[PDB]
Swiss-Prot record, chain A:
Descriptive protein name: Cullin-1
Listed InterPro entries: Cullin (IPR045093), Cullin_CS (IPR016157), Cullin_homology (IPR016158), Cullin_homology_sf (IPR036317), Cullin_N (IPR001373), Cullin_neddylation_domain (IPR019559), Cullin_repeat-like_dom_sf (IPR016159), WH-like_DNA-bd_sf (IPR036388)
Gene that encodes the chain: CUL1
Position(s), cross-link Glycyl lysine isopeptide (Lys-Gly) (interchain with G-Cter in NEDD8): 685
Keyword Ubl conjugation included in the entry's annotation: yes
Biological source species: Homo sapiens (Human)
From Swiss-Prot, chain B:
Lineage: Eukaryota, Metazoa, Chordata, Craniata, Vertebrata
Keywords linked to the UniProt accession: Acetylation, Nucleus, Repeat, Transcription, Ubl conjugation, Ubl conjugation pathway
Organism: Homo sapiens
UniProt GO cellular component terms: cytosol; nucleus
Protein name (database record): Cullin-associated NEDD8-dissociated protein 2
Maturation and modification: Ubiquitinated and targeted for proteasomal degradation.
Family statement drawn from the similarity comment of this UniProt entry: Belongs to the CAND family.
Gene for this chain: CAND2
Location of this chain's protein in the cell: Nucleus
Amino acid sequence: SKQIGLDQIWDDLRAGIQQVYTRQSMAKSRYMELYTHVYNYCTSVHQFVGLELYKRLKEFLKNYLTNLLKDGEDLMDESVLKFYTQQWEDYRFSSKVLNGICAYLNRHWVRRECDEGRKGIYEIYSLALVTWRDCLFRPLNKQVTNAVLKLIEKERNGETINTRLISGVVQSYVELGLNEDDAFAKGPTLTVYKESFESQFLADTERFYTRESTEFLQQNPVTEYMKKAEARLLEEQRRVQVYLHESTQDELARKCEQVLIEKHLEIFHTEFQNLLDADKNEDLGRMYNLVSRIQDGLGELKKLLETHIHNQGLAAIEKCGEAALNDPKMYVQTVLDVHKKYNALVMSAFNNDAGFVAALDKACGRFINNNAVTKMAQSSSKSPELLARYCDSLLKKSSKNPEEAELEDTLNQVMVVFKYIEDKDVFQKFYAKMLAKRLVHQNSASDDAEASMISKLKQACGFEYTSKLQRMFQDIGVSKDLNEQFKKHLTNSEPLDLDFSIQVLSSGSWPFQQSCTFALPSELERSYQRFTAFYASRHSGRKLTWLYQLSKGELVTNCFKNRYTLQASTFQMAILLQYNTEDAYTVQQLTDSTQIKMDILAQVLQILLKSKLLVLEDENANVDEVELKPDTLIKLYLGYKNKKLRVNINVPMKTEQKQEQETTHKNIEEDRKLLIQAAIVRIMKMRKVLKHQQLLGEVLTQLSSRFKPRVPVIKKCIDILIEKL
Amino acid sequence: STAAFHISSLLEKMTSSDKDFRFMATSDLMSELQKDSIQLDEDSERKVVKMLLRLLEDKNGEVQNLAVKCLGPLVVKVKEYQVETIVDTLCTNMRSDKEQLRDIAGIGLKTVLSELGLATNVCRKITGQLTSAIAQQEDVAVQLEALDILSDMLSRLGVPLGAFHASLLHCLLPQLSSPRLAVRKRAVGALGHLAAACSTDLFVELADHLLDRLPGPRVPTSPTAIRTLIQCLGSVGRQAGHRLGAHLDRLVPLVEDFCNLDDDELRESCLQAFEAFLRKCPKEMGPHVPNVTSLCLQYIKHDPNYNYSDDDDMSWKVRRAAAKCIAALISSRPDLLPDFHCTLAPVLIRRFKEREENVKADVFTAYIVLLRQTQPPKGWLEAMEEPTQTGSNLHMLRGQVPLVVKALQRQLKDRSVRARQGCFSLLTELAGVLPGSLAEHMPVLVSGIIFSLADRSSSSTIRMDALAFLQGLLGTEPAEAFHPHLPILLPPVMACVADSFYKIAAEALVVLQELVRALWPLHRPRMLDPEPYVGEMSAVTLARLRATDLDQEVKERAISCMGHLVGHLGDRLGDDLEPTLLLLLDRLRNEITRLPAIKALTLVAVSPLQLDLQPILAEALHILASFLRKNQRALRLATLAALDALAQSQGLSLPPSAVQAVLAELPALVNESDMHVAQLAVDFLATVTQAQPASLVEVSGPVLSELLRLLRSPLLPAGVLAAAEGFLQALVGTRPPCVDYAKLISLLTAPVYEQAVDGGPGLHKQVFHSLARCVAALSAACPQEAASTASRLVCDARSPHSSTGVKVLAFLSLAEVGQVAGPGHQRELKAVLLEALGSPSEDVRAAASYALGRVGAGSLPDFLPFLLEQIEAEPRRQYLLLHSLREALGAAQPDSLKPYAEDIWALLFQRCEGAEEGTRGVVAECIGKLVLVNPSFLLPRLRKQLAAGRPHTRSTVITAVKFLISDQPHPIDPLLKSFIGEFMESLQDPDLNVRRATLAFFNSAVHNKPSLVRDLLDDILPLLYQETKIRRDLIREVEMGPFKHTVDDGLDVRKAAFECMYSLLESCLGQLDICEFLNHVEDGLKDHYDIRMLTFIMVARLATLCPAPVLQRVDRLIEPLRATCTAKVKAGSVKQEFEKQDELKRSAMRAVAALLTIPEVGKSPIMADFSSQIRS
């Protein structure tokens, strides 16, 4: 190959390149010609004496950069950025084209590059950028960084600036971070950008936001501060997304969340409580959205919410006072109002978070059971009982039948309350009693709603809570069918004197018990004996449920000028039938004959006298102020005149009401005994023998689905069973 | 080897020998082993299902609930190959006729559905089984439970059944005609639940099928036939009415025709359907609003049985439905508020006398909804308003109030609790909307309140509601109206304080405190003689406060009420003043009444009655000093406030020993950890310095040291610095032998003095600003101590021997001493400052410019002519001189610059023709702040300059008017709002500079005050988009070799327009067209890189601000994003292009993910395939 002289060609391309650095005025011709002349031949020239040529190029670039620095330090103080940008783009294009053309002579020789970094040709591919970093970047870096930070702080206050200058300067910063570890590594090194601009910017941001947040909170309420912080966070993420490198982004977010939100958490907590005292749901939503960013920052919010719900429920139930113990409606409605309000709040403002739902459930499951009403009832088994009674008042016949949709909503609300009560066997017992007493007297407003209620209970608890109820329904249907069949038989034989209804109830299902002795009047004797004979001919192997105090009906009196129909119970029927011969009877003789207890007979006597169907010895004597002694005489009020033909006298008694309260006490104690023994001794037998401590701990979670056993009770059961373990 | 023989050993235990033990055996089988307790031999699992067939109907099913709570995890631990088998066997035993296996089958299938090709197949099998049960199984007990499970399963499984939905509707259509309405109602409910996610055409099929069977061909029909159809219509209404607008126009007349029929339940159904349609479809129901309205206005009055059998009437249901319909109509359509006030509000009022209870409650709720609708916009209830539309509504309500009061007068003494509570709530709402309107009716309302305060038999709820109503009335109505009725109103309230129910006592105490704070204001002369009442007030409050067995709430309320009573009527307590104070002192010691007692003591001290707090000063001061040591922020703030108030009130009548004791604690409080406490402590120190200087001798040292250490911090707000300034004012004004200034700057400069090398770790520029500002403010605080040192510092600092910090601090201190208290004369300072302005250091140059600017304002008539002469003769250093002029006009009041202002004008535009950008900008702010001298007279000159002048002049004018925007309200706001049109019409100028400056003006206006441009947006938006489009004339691809990047000069205006577009997006969303917005987004997304990033941010924001238009447009929006992501750049590219391509790819990925967060976008193939390619 040829070896042409060095100085002439060297000066030639030196003049060519110093022309090329200036803006192009000629055409493409010499641009191809000179660089082709270099590429084809001077590969050897630019290799060995190319060291001297490149040193001369380096010193030429050094003087050029010194000239630029001298010409670019006149006044500036803000116009530094325009100069730095324009020069950066121009020098970038010039260096890019020069490095694309001239470096091809010495590049692609990775074999020589590996050895000692190709002597002094190490990383000189970007030696233009190296000279930019050393000669010009070093003197002006402080000034340009200060100008950029001043512009950013100026934009933060509200003014508008040309973001292109900042974008260009930060792109230049990240560009000079050459990857010296590997010349072919896919990924930039941000060493210079991090060490010269990022740390200062982050410190300035944290200082500015500390100062601004403190000054704002010192002279404003918390709500406006939350409003401002929510906007500031997205503002400072948009800044990075627009005119800053991506590597900063995440870090910057952290810093903002460490200054605008976390450091003020204490204040937030207090404000949270105040918000709960005013019910400002949107502000609560904003606070939840803000605190969601801080990790493990939601726990105190959950504790405060649970405590607030508990206190609100306790206060709301206490405010009712003494009237709750006898009015199920207000108790259940207060509970439902509190639960509905706070569940709506949790679902709307707090975005139905699992932890907040658990907090609501824990708060509601602690003031259903232990509140003022049960505390003054001296037993935690008052919350279920009242609930059961409420259901009764929703299904008995009333003057204003509730709307079907309203009824279904109310039953669903009763279920969402019943989900919380600890003692559920008490609820089952009281519901069974109320259902039996409603079915016998046929007080059911509608069979469809009642069947829906039973279905809801079955889904809630299982088949045990509804097996007995389904048995009762089937028994009442069978009794209706048997009554129809006996009516058919009567139509096929001698008919009865009066139309009466009879129901046969299996003794193994219904809770009724026989506790009184009675003497049959001669009027019902023929029906009694005929029915007993017929049932003996029909059924065997069981025992008839013959009860009289639960039997009522209607009677017609021929002893009044205007024919009246009196609906009354069997005891009143016997009392009136005894007057068919003699209208004047003494109380002792009535007790001896009718076999009615003194309290029941006395109560029936006041009920009859108040209705004016009977009279005492003195007709003008006040019934309430006159005591009924065994020698008291009662006479029939023959001249009974009234506007209404049909008269009801079978009214539940206040003394019978208190007796029923005593029977509820007996029901509660029966629940206690049955519960304890026949539901813990069996499971203790089931568990066999163990260490006697974890056994106690784990037997509580096998019966927990229907009550909660008490530790002394289980200890007593173990002591009783120690005879046989 | 744990779960290898353990399972098989227990298998032999289920051979009917451990029936009692089987219950525990299964519970033990389910234990903490749910990690890898699965192996081969599914024979064990089929034996398990066979044995759980024995945890079933047998033994009366006693272990069924526990059995299923155990099998839940068991039936999820079954694996798919047995999942199909168990589903099949559950279906087969559902076919079984036992009425017991079906329950377990259903609940187990529900558990399986909750846990979950195979899944789809088992779901199809379940749906087919349910359909066969509903249709084929013609027995009630199976259909009812099948519908139950189907409804409870659609409630959470809407989407997986999309294939079977079309068939399901069919099996549910004849069910609306079956007998035994127990199935019919649940069929209607299930159909309503289904018609919530039934595709988009299935709902149409259901609607136009249900419509067909409804009408009668102009012939009456039995109501039983159409009742269920109308009920189903109402159900689908309440569920998904927003999909029935197309059929509303044909459904409404038929429903009205049926409503005209004579049936109570039918009328109920029709009115409920109308309510559902009105609340769910407001726009489509427009042309039908009048007709239905008339119906309501009739049937709200419908009550034939009552002249103007209790178990067989339902007209009250008709009236309740009508009232609810009226409420829904009122709430749905605010646009027709005035018309309602002429047609709806009167009739409603006439129905306040409804005989029923629920009807009356709903009428009250409707009127309350109307009242809340008439509410004027919040945040403006502080001044009178012009007679706008809201003015007309408020006038209508003000004319309405007398009729409401007259109609509600009788009910306030009703026997029922509910009616009185309703009246109280309604009157509270009416008073809240219209303050000061119920005063004329006070003789009535007060009477009613008394009737609810003497009530004894009923619950305490009515009493508490009466007290709350009285408290609200005291809050709203003016005090004077209560004067005549005080003798009758006051006793009962007091009688409620001594109640045995503590809630009533607390409420009475709060009401009493409000009453005494309102009737006898603090800072005004007393119009009502308080002698007759104060004795009883004090007796009741003291008797309630002296019982220590009471509750906490009553204790707190009593303490607060007694504090207010003392503070407002200390004159009239008399002999009870001395004991009462002591009581408060005692409550100041307990850990449960610290804060209420502190607040009461603060309020007592603040009051202007000039009380004699002598007996308790020492004890209170010692207790508060003890409280200062505890580490509680709220308690510390309360204690500092109490101490400050007490010292200010007492003045010179306080013991010295207690002062020293409390002062011994303060130096620990002055720290940078908390700033509010430090400010309060410094204020208290200043107050006690002003009061009793002699107590400061032994505490000056540590206090001064901690104050200096606090001033070191760069985070001092203005309040702390002002408090420190006042502290030093007092400390020098007292002329004490301890500290008397001349030490703050010294100590602060002590580290600065040791900085003998100007190359070490200097402060940050903002740290420089903060520290030097604090130091200079301290120097300028006291002028008497620094009078001679002001001249001394110039002489001792003009020598260039001191470091840069001393120099800059010298100029800043000179500027501050000339600014704070009188302009420093310093007749020879002008030459020295001018000489030093050309300092080699930039910080010293900025300090000198600030010094000249701040000293010129204080002596403008003398220096302003000199400064203008220097500018005219010597234009060489115009930059710093122009900054000084800007600062001068900034710090000089306009009233003192009016005579000469025009002269400055003649200078400023004289230099506007230069080619320097910075000088042009500085002149722009100078003009902008000069306009503040007189806006009305100086604005037209700038307007005419913009209209006719050199572009370099109108550019500066528009920059100045842009800088004229202030964030706070400013007097030029009306003038700017009126005159902004001419300025905004400047974009027609072809010059780049004017258009860019106007775009910046618009951006600033939208960012700061959207009201300036809002009303004009419709005349701005179109022409603004004209700037968005790319202009190729400015685009010049200059010939730079073969390859060259085009130097587009029209990029800045596009960037400014896009910034304005983002600002409108964030602030003015309500006055934009989304279609053209997205079209311009698409047009600009292909523009330069910066525009690409900003458009990506806009798309990300719009993915949350308008999901539907973005979902519609994404089908084509993805293609630019896909091209941007899939573009391949050669590896020979230098680092700039690699970084840019990576950044744009990541931004496009973020935009794609933001779009993907929308569920509908997730159901298209293009981005699913794009995500699959990204993953691969």
